[PDB]
Design a protein around this ligand. Structure first.
Ligand SMILES: [Ca+2]
Ligand SMILES: [Ca+2]
Ligand SMILES: [Ca+2]
Ligand SMILES: [Zn+2]
Length: 493
């Protein structure tokens, strides 16, 4: 149960999912090369994209300044074990990994893993920026949130480098709401600014500029979530846009101290939501609550100004009790204190689809709470540790759910590239080790089937590994020893 090594390994899943013309330059995995490079030359028309003929006609000079009739929506990361790039979870992974790097930068540095983190975060955010088509004044005209289609992509199984199937570009326009994805993306870029403002001021400024523009687009235009027919159909069904909107707003206030953003956050912030679910691609209310609480600690610790402003904004009585950290304390008491179902084996299980993804998100929140409350481990961090240790092998199957981490790790993740096979049903060993991938996890009875075609319990994804990265760093922060060394034989930048 070496958290330094866990942190190191955790990011390699991202190298395995890098997409586009920049993968041999950015990925540390020799078995990954440039893929879907035709994404970089997507034809600008109403069939290869989902923008109307009229929209393209009126906006051609901004969408295609050079006039070669093609746009570049290449880059970023494949979503899961598949090759589609879905906007909602793409932004969730980018912001959540960024969220962890922002909170525990000291640990990434102490373990020599900060450079790896920055390469991954730059790859996520540079993709978002290239996909944000703005006029010269900075106004967002269109945002490509998805490349590919589950309906088409899932019908194939092979290395991404050899794929040639149709990969449509889906764009958000002022003609139809896309508030959830636009906001989720703006949040990531605002976090990118926070992560690079001291280290690369110019790059940070660019990220912040794009973040503010995206948020303004979300703010100014009619509200709604991107619909299934406009790209994610049943793969990533979005519940709402208000949490992503508030998440972006909170981060933008942190980045700019422009009161307007805090006012927007307070206008839609559901104080009752955090304790309900946990941080995930379809609900970032808990993460939002954490940021608003840190904002309060930073700028309004000894007074009730922010609390009273929030009550006025969400029309609550002035005497209602509001403590920005309380919703998260409730969430954590629920997760660490017996509120959420725990398996006979001692694993806190929300539900079977990506239980590990939910568990590690709770771990992250637990570690962030302790950091901001004396920066010392409490029952929350201690609980988080018990959960990470379960996932690392302290369970009924003595099974490590992080592939490649140990001899007892799962070995057959549901992943096209790593498998090196032509069919998920083929039971042969994988040609490559998908180091650091956190699989769906065990079922409610601590059982697990380690097969390439077990798409529930062996599923892997950018959103699955997102909070997991931060949790490892957070655990190293409070529990790392001199005995916890990174693996010197792993590829490095
Ligand atoms: Ca062009
Ligand atoms: Ca949402
Ligand atoms: Ca206050
Ligand atoms: Zn690709």
């Amino acid at each position: 149960y070496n958290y330094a090594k866990a942190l190191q390994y955790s990011m390699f899943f991202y190298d395995a999912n890098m997409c586009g013309t920049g993968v041999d330059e950015n990925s540390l995995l020799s078995w990954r090369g440039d893929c879907h490079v035709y994404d970089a030359r997507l034809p600008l028309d109403s069939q290869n994209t989902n923008m109307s003929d009229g929209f393209i006609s009126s906006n051609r000079s901004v969408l295609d300044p050079d006039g070669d009739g093609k746009v570049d929506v290449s880059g970023g990361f494949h979503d899961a074990g598949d090759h589609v790039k879905f906007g909602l979870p793409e932004a969730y992974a980018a912001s959540t990994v960024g969220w962890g790097y922002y909170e525990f930068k000291d640990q990434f540095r102490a373990t020599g893993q900060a450079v790896h983190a920055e390469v991954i975060l730059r790859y996520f955010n540079d993709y978002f920026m290239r996909c944000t088509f703005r006029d010269a004044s900075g106004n967002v005209v269109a945002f490509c949130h998805q490349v590919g289609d589950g309906d088409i992509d899932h019908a194939f199984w092979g290395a991404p480098e050899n794929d040639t199937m149709f990969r449509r570009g889906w764009f958000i326009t002022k003609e139809k709401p896309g508030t959830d994805i636009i906001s989720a993306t703006a949040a990531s870029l605002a976090i990118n600014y926070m992560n690079f403002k001291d280290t690369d001021p110019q790059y940070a400024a660019k990220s912040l500029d794009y973040a503010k523009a995206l948020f303004d687009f979300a703010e100014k235009n009619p509200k709604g979530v991107v619909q299934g027919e406009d790209g994610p159909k049943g793969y990533y069904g979005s519940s709402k846009w208000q949490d992503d909107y508030c998440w972006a707003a909170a981060w933008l206030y942190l980045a700019t101290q422009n009161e307007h953003y805090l006012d927007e956050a307070f206008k839609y912030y559901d104080y009752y939501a955090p304790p309900g679910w946990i941080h995930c691609w379809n609900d970032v209310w808990s993460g939002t609550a954490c940021i608003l609480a840190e904002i309060n600690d930073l700028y309004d610790k000894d007074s009730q100004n922010f609390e009273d402003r929030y009550k006025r904004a969400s029309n609550k009585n002035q005497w209602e009790q509001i403590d920005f950290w309380k919703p998260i304390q409730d969430l954590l008491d629920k997760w660490s204190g017996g509120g959420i179902t725990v398996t006979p084996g001692g694993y806190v299980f929300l539900n079977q689809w990506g239980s590990a993804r939910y568990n590690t998100a709770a771990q992250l929140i637990a570690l962030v709470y302790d950091k901001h409350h004396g920066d010392t481990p409490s029952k929350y961090a201690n609980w988080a540790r018990s959960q990470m240790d379960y996932l690392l092998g302290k369970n009924p199957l003595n099974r490590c759910y992080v592939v490649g981490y140990s001899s007892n790790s799962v070995k057959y993740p549901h992943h096209r590239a790593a498998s090196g096979l032509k069919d998920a049903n083929d039971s042969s060993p994988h040609k490559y080790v998908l180091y650091g991938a956190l699989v769906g996890g065990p079922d409610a009875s601590d059982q697990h089937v380690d097969r390439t075609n077990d798409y529930i319990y062996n599923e892997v994804a950018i959103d699955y590994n997102a909070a997991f990265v931060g949790a490892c760093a957070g655990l190293y922060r409070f529990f790392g020893d001199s005995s916890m060394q990174i693996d010197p034989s792993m590829p490095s930048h």
